[PDB]
Amino acid sequence: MPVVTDKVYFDITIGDEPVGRVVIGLFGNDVPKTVENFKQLASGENGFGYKGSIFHRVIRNFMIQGGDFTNFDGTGGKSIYGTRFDDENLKIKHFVGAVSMANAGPNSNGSQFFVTTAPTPWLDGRHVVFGKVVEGMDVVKKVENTKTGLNDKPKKAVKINDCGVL
């Protein structure tokens, strides 16, 4: 079990109703560069980041995907190191409540991430896992249960109304 070194929170709304807080524990001794990127995007300290962004793709019994604060539809986002950065460690395995980098092939992490809600071992070795949910799995449940339309887009927006570093 990787060790949790820092924690960040997201306060979620669904179509504007508050639905609670998720707290994500980060594995900062194992993937320090990936964890730095996520923290700073959660604090917004570079002038951009997660606050006000959405979970644009939600699949029940699979994952919820967010972090695209540039285009809001899964095509965008950016790291603190520029557009994209390399895979830090691909040895940490997925598990229920893992928090992991979306990508588009090797070494293309940006700001997009997912929280799994069931086992996803077919992603292992392919996406960098850098954290886990340590509180608010109930809230993660609500999100994965919203009504969705075309390409798994929630009908009501699922917003990170606020976030930051605990």
């Binding site: 699949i59 995907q65 997912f114 077919w122």
Partner: peptide, 11 residues
């Protein structure tokens, strides 16, 4: 299949 990209999004 069940994937998590960043631009295209496959089966």
């Amino acid at each position: 299949x069940l994937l998590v990209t960043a631009g295209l999004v496959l089966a």
